[PDB]
Amino acid sequence: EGPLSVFGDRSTGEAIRSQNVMAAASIANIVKSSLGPVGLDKMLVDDIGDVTITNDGATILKLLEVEHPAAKVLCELADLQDKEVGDGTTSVVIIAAELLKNADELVKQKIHPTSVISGYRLACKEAVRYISENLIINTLGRDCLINAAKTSMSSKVIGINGDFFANLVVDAVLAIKYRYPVNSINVLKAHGRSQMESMLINGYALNVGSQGMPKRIVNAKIACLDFSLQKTKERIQKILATGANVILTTGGIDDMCLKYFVEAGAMAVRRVLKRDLKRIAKASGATVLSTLANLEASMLGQAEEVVQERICDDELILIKNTKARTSASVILRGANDFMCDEMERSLHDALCVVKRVLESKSVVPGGGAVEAALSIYLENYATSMGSREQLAIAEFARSLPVIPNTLAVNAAQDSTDLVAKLRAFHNEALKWIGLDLVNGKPRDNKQAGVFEPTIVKVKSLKFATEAAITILRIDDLIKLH
């Protein structure tokens, strides 16, 4: 009868379950290094020899040539963790592995995994509850954000005035905030003066066509035309018939057509980047009509104000006050051109961080603060459970202080110590206590700007635990080649 065939790998006893854990350990530990702001990127060179330096777990696991099937599990998790909440992709992997290492301990105690599985399922669900009860709900709330935006400007040349720019972000966001559209902030750079003069426009900033047409138009009726106005008086009569005072042609405008616009007192800007025209169709809501023979009075956008200011003494069309306040501009000014490039990229980051904080009101203090609390609360929960479940939930709480435990290691901030001081200060200064690798001491993240959406956490543990459950539920697997 024979156990199996020439093609049927059979793994039993500690042989299978163990080798599966180790694989998960190896994998997790790998991406564990790139955990935190001090992450240690990895140079991935697949078959052909390519070189992709990354810090994200998913990217790494999606390029890492894994042989052991069970190890591929952490790859599916990092995948799900990236297409659902993004960040924390590395955490899920690490935690999952720890849950196993601790699971085996009980396993060594002749404790059938099944039992252990139950402990994790109940512990995790309980852990999630503590979340919807310790949701540090941000205030649109200023103060908090200013601090966060300040952490994004630091560690850069802009760090000198990072504060001034920290506010611009909070303002630009709180203005177009409804869900924060990062693609709504038009950051226009232009070398001129010091970065201390950088301001925030109440609308769009276009870096008149004729010194005759009105430089300022109140209730503007932006008429975005695709096709140019070059072969004549009949095409200008069609635009003047709809009441379009502001014409935005993507192509060049014939000299004659421009002379007619001055005659009708219509401000039209020729040769407008395709990208700009699109932003105008989103702001004032101006319809983009290709042919000038299909432009009606119902395709005109509304811009409460479209004037040409001399920013740093340059000609710029500021089409602000549009009907859709979902459009704004942050005039970024800097000494050199190369300087405006960096400050600009910094602004983008800040806009993203602020966004996150604004999305999902229920947020919590990262730096490991959360995991710590879960380690204490779940510990007690284990005490009031008895039976194997106790050790299960218990160890589960011992697999949580890893996030902060590792963060320290990535900052020469002796783990064993900080991990501890983090607990003592956690139940003495309340939940808002995590590890700040900057000063190497338990700091108030909730006051430092360090935050993480409530959902992010919920899914990690829910993904890590379950994934481990299906693994432990594997006592003997036979997969042919």
């Binding site: 009031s384 194997r388 106790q390 501890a420 607990r423």
Partner: protein, 359 residues
């Protein structure tokens, strides 16, 4: 480059710690089975064919040819406990080893040894404290001595006639009790007949005349008595009595972990281990019977943190049980010294950085 003698095995730093710690652990395991009212007597056999049967840790460790110095320290710990408390020689031996099992996970990581001793030292301090602030003191109450004289004999082979012997013990002790000197009571084993014939030839100074069918029901009985005289004596000498069944261990192990969350730094994690180690007592207690240690252990902590400092482990029934109501009391000193000898000693074990040997 001969810098070592002939046949000298000497390791350095971290490695020396591993070897020493391991040696002690495995050595205690041997006598760890003799623990509990139903321990497993061992039949040591020297190189001359002499086979001996003993349930005492000291007697065993003194008959086992130990070449490893680290393992020799354990024999010393067994000799200090055998001449300072008597029974329990195994407890201190096993305990000292367990502690080494809890430090190892730190030493194999990098944690400096001395830093470990500091915690352990501090841990022992705190531990003993609670033992001298929760102990019990009641009573020459022949009513309380007999009751405990029957609970002591029980769990042994003389639990069948625990009624009679318990009396002869309380009487033998009630006569010579200025502080009761175990050197004033002469026991005379006389293999022959039935344990129901035994008498106590009393004023002061008695001679427990014993009689048993065979030396098996004769010796196994005698030993069980010597214990009743060890417990009934204490309650009269040192009123200090603590809850047995690994109860105390379970409480200390709890609070000690609480002092961890409070005391941050290295000590937190370690002090927690020092506690996890104190879980070995009630752990092996069930294993020496056939019941799952995990279930009971976990059950105990719950019933312990939700009951009191008396909730131990009624091995006889294999389930948690309040020792205060089960009349399970032992002298407070027994524990008081256990923590001392075992702990502090174990510390030095990891303190001994490298060992130089010769041919």
């Amino acid at each position: 480059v001969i810098l070592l003698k002939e046949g000298t095995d000497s390791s350095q730093g971290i490695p020396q710690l591993v070897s020493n710690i391991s040696a002690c652990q495995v050595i205690a395991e041997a006598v760890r089975t003799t623990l509990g009212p139903r321990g497993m007597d061992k039949l040591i056999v020297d190189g001359r064919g002499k086979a001996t049967i003993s349930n005492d840790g000291a007697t065993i460790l003194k008959l086992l040819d130990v070449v490893h110095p680290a393992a020799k320290t354990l024999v010393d710990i067994a000799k200090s406990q055998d001449a300072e408390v008597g029974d329990g020689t195994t407890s201190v031996t096993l305990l000292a080893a367990e502690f080494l099992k809890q430090v190892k996970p730190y030493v194999e990581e990098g944690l400096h040894p001395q830093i470990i001793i500091r915690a352990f030292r501090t841990a022992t301090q705190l531990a003993v404290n609670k033992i001298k602030e929760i102990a019990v003191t009641v009573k020459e109450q022949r009513k309380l001595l007999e009751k405990c004289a029957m609970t002591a004999l029980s769990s042994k082979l003389i639990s069948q006639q625990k009624a009679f012997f318990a009396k002869m013990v309380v009487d033998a002790v009630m006569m010579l009790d200025d502080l009761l000197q175990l050197k004033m009571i002469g026991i005379k084993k006389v293999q022959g007949g039935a344990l129901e014939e035994s008498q106590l030839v009393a004023a002061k100074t008695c001679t427990i005349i014993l009689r048993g069918g065979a030396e098996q029901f004769m010796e196994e009985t005698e030993r069980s008595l010597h214990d009743a005289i060890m417990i009934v004596r204490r309650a009269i000498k040192n009123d200090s009595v603590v809850a047995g069944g690994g109860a105390i261990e379970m409480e200390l192990s709890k609070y000690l972990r609480d002092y961890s969350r409070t005391i941050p730094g290295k000590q937190q994690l370690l002090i927690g281990a020092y506690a996890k180690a104190l879980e070995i007592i009630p752990r092996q207690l069930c294993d020496n019977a056939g019941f799952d240690a995990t279930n009971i252990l976990n059950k105990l902590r719950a019933r312990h943190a939700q009951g009191g400092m008396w909730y131990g482990v009624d091995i006889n029934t294999e389930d948690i049980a309040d020792n205060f109501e089960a009349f399970v009391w032992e002298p407070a000193m027994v524990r008081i010294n256990a923590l001392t000898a075992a702990s502090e000693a174990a510390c030095l074990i990891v303190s001994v950085d490298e060992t130089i040997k010769n041919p």
